């Protein structure tokens, strides 16, 4: 056996030039795709503003159009998904973890157009859903499609192209190349058993995509919190406690996100229409709040800066928190195409600020700044829910550029994963593949 | 498939006992590394207050600079040759093995040897990093609490060993993220599944990182401040800088190894012809550490100065070559010490250089040598040890210049691609094959 090792060692990191050159072409396409998808979403949300400007006069006629536009966009959304690709629904991340295990199919000839135009509707409508979802899954199929189109054979070529497409898509979605890689190698990849995935082949893809995003999205970031303060050592425990909190709540939020999936299923039973309509209902409901209180609706980024700065009252926080916990489930559990990834980031941020404020006063001698605890908890849900901290801490640190908080960032995020395990929780993204992979047997 | 659904619902459920031990391992590796670090420093210092004592006479001054490092290096190699032939070298490969279960973890020996062994080699001021000694003192520490508490199973044994490692690398470069990423990218069993609890590790890493902070706050290791940004029409320049590090990476590998063989003859295997050739190279370095500190020492002290551009295009090329020398001579001689950090101090230098040449040929880019310095600071860890993801993150974690990230990767990736297409191999892996093969033969 050792005689074998000595063989493999001297043979390590030698990936087929052909696999590398395709990861490079996959990336370039995912990048262009994610850029395009991003552009389209924005154009739509915009066309809706230039529709509320068109009726600024009449208020009720104003609240109506805000609704009917998101309602009419979400419908066209859910439809495309129900009629042409029932997998496009939901995040779309689990459907890839599956495809890497060879348990799920990669119907790209369908999922690409569906998930795409399917998402423009749901995001264009302004619901509470992230972009990664649609892009991580649009990414996979991209890698798949070039795999099949170029005929490339083998486990490496299949698992690799399919895994760069996922990671490249997550990078161009949050403009964070490192988090893209760290995601595959920490979650996305076959969690129990060796796999033929060329990490170096991935980078290439991630970069190619990241660059395509920069070509079109330079001079302005996504989240900008500037440079908050430092965290003295005698301060650390506070982020452990903030971690314990996120820890016990993480599982709960998981119970909700799933149960709601079932409950929201009855409401339509499975009927395409009772579904497409329940969609337009939640779609317009979000296009509404996106006017009468934007902080409860929409993706979630716009408010991260405002919360970290502390420009929200201790009340305005709790309100947004709850209101959002609602708008988020209502949107993810409904089965609309869209990652429940970013909204968790927007959520932790809010629960973070809050913890900060309370801390701020109880300990005046610490000279705290709610902002630090906001950034500490910004990725703490990704820790207790999806249960992947290493990707969380690096995605944050990559968007908030506050490396002097790294320690607290981990101590919070770690305490979250320990309190999610000891209180029963599970990998929200995994639990979903079990739910779907079982419902394939269960129905036999 | 029906098995997967079972495993999924069971994922990330590591034995509380394993976690609580990763926590105690870390705390110890942390305290250890701090202690080690303090020791080295105290020694290097004691040597200054020895050159102050003879500032008058120059030749008598150059002698003492030598005889102290010579006498410290000998006592170093000795302890390694007489009580633990594995403590020699980096010490990183001896753990990659240990995780494969191909090598042994003689902690009852290696801890005291590697430790006082290094204090001798570093305190003398030779060209070796701290990670090696601490990554290996780390693993053993993991082991020790594994045997001492008698935790059984594969998870408990592979996990406490790896955290010991990671946590060891962290407190060495005060960079928790890199610690983790190292294990999961290099250190772990590269071809097969393994029972390692990632979450268990963090805990260790943190515990260590915190121990370091408890005693080493208020100042960093490398401080280059905040350099400029890098326009898109500038990227290709880092790819080229990457292609360079890429073809030279393998060559530096051939040298680091061949020199190992050639330096072997000079003593044959004889404990003394070795312990002496050690005091020779040890005193040689304690000398240059006076007549030209840039050629000797760990290598950190000069990274700031080079990135700032406070070195002539000549003074660079000199330091580079002088160092490529002082580095092999020290690592291939088999002394206890990582050839990790010194590659960092090397990339930085070759980086600055590329910078300067670029700066002038393209005045319309408005470049700053410093950005290419930091783009290449981790470019050797990319072409030699062939682990980029850990490199890019190690740098980024010490230089804090996230706005360079794109170039950093494009350089580093270009290095790994030019190292593969030009024959090279994982310098840290190739060393395990060398030793694992010399074992069954």
């Amino acid at each position, epitope marked *: 056996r050792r005689r074998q090792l000595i063989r493999q060692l001297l043979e390590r990191d030698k990936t087929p030039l052909a696999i590398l050159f395709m990861a490079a072409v996959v990336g370039t396409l995912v990048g262009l795709a994610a850029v395009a998808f991003d552009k389209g979403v924005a154009w739509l949300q915009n066309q809706r503003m230039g529709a509320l400007v068109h009726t600024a006069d009449n208020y009720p006629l104003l609240l109506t159009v805000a609704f009917l536009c998101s309602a009419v966009l979400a419908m066209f959304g859910y439809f495309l998904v129900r009629k042409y690709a029932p997998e496009a629904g939901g995040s779309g991340i689990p459907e890839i973890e599956g495809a890497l295990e060879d348990q799920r199919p990669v119907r790209w000839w369908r999922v690409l157009p569906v998930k795409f135009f399917g998402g423009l509707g749901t995001l264009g409508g302004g619901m509470v859903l992230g972009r990664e979802g649609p892009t991580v899954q649009i990414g996979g199929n991209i890698g798949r499609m070039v795999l099949d189109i170029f005929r490339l054979k083998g486990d490496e070529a299949r698992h690799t192209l399919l895994a760069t497409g996922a990671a490249a898509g997550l990078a161009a979605a949050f403009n964070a190349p490192l988090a893209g890689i760290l995601f595959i190698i920490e979650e996305m990849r076959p969690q129990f058993r060796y796999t033929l995935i060329s990490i170096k082949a991935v980078f290439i893809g991630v970069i190619m995509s990241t660059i395509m995003y920069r070509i079109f999205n330079h001079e302005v970031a996504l989240i900008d919190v500037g440079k908050l*303060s430092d965290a*003295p*050592l*005698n*301060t650390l425990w506070l982020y452990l406690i903030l971690g314990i909190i996120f820890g016990i709540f993480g599982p709960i939020f998981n119970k909700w996100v799933l149960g709601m999936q079932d409950l929201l299923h009855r409401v339509h039973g499975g009927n395409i229409t009772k579904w497409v309509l329940m969609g337009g209902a939640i779609g317009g409901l979000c296009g509404l709040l996106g006017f009468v209180a934007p902080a409860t609706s929409g993706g979630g980024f716009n408010l991260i800066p405002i919360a970290t700065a*502390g420009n929200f009252s201790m009340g305005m926080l709790v309100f947004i928190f709850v209101a959002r916990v609602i708008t988020t489930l209502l949107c993810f559990s409904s089965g609309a195409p869209g990652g429940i990834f970013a909204p968790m980031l927007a959520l932790g941020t809010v629960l973070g600020t809050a913890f900060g404020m309370v801390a701020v006063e109880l*300990f*005046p*001698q*610490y*000279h705290l*700044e709610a902002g630090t605890f906001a950034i500490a908890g910004m990725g703490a849900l990704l820790a207790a829910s999806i249960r992947a901290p290493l990707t969380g801490i690096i995605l944050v640190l990559e968007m908030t550029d506050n490396y002097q908080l790294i320690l607290p960032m981990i101590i919070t995020g770690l305490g979250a994963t320990l309190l999610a395990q000891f209180t029963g929780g599970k990998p929200l993204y995994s639990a979903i593949l079990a739910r779907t992979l079982a419902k394939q047997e269960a129905e036999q | 498939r029906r098995q997967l659904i079972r495993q999924l619902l069971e994922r990330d459920k590591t034995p509380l006992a394993i976690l609580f031990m990763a926590a105690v391992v870390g705390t110890l590796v942390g305290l250890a590394a701090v202690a080690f670090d303090k020791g080295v420093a105290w020694l290097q210092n004691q040597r200054m207050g020895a050159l102050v004592h003879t500032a008058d006479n120059y030749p008598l001054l150059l002698t003492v600079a030598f005889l102290c490092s010579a006498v410290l290096a000998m006592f170093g190699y000795f302890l390694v040759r007489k009580y633990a032939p594995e403590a020699g070298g980096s010490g990183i490969p001896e753990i990659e093995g240990a995780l494969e279960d191909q090598r042994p973890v003689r902690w009852w020996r290696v801890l005291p040897v590697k430790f006082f062994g290094g204090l001798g080699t570093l305190g003398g001021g030779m060209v070796l990093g701290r990670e090696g000694p601490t990554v290996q003192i780390g693993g053993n520490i993991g082991r020790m609490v594994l045997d001492i508490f008698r935790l059984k199973g594969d998870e408990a044994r592979h996990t406490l060993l790896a955290t010991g490692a990671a946590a060891g690398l962290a407190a060495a470069f005060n960079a928790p993220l890199a610690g983790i990423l190292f294990i999961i990218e290099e250190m772990r069993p590269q071809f097969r599944y393994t029972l390692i609890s990632i979450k268990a590790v963090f805990i260790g890493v943190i515990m260590s990182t915190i121990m370091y902070r408890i005693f080493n*706050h*208020e100042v960093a290791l490398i401080d280059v401040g905040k350099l400029s940004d890098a326009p898109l029409n500038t990227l290709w320049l880092y790819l080229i800088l990457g292609i360079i590090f890429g073809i030279f990476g393998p060559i530096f590998n051939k040298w680091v190894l061949g020199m190992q063989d050639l330096l072997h003859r000079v003593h044959g295997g004889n404990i003394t012809k070795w312990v002496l050739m050690g005091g020779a190279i040890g005193g040689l370095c304690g000398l240059l550490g006076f007549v030209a500190p840039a050629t000797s020492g760990g290598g950190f002290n000069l990274i700031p100065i080079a990135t700032a551009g406070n070195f002539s295009m000549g003074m660079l090329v000199f330091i580079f070559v002088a160092r490529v020398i002082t580095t092999l001579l020290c690592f291939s001689s088999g002394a206890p010490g990582g050839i990790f950090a010194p590659m960092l101090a090397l990339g930085t230098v070759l980086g600055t250089a590329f910078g300067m040449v670029a700066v002038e040929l393209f005045p319309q880019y408005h470049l700053e040598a410093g950005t290419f310095a930091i783009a290449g600071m981790g470019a050797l860890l990319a072409a030699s040890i062939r682990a980029p993801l850990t490199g890019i993150i190690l740098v980024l974690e010490m230089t804090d210049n996230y706005q360079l990230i794109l170039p950093m990767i494009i350089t580093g990736l270009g290095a790994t691609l030019l190292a593969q297409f030009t024959g090279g191999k994982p310098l840290y892996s190739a060393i395990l094959a060398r030793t694992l093969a010399k074992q069954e033969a």
Partner: antibody
Amino acid sequence: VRLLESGGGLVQPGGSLKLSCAASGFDYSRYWMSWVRQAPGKGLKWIGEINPVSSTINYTPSLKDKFIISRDNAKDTLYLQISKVRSEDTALYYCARLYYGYGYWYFDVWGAGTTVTVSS
Amino acid sequence: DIVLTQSPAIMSAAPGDKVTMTCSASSSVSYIHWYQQKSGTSPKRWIYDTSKLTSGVPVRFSGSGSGTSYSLTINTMEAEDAATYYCQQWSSHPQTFGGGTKLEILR
């Protein structure tokens, strides 16, 4: 790094006076700054403190606006306004810069401090 | 508002001697800080975090103490240690200072 505070003087009971501390040689932001006063023969008594973005300002236990503390991060200066002054205000006023080791803040760098006199 | 109370009010000691001055909090304090003040000069930050010497203090000084009682010592004081020391805590908002111990060279 210099902490030069001016503005002290002779005011009469019931008066006012803006003390001023100007800083040089180190980034004014990122820092917390606070005033401490010493009455002759007597000891040091912390007056108040203020952070970078002056989003927080705390005083020792005093009446409503006995003390108004502000800083202007553009002129790298810290002020301190006292009002309705009694002789208990007759003192030497120091400005500091705030930092920490483990995290239990101390008064890092002092200044020479101007003198207030409260008389008729 | 812990009440720090320095011990000897005023005290003399001949050079090379060994001196200790106290600082008893009224409640619980942690990492007392010390300041030196030579007639005419604004306080200087001597010892901090109960035992650390601020970059520059002669190692003649040694900070110490715990929970309710702390102290400072000069292992062989010189004459350039003629000053007045102020203990200070800020483990419990708001910061408080000691009564001050006056150190005077005996001759």
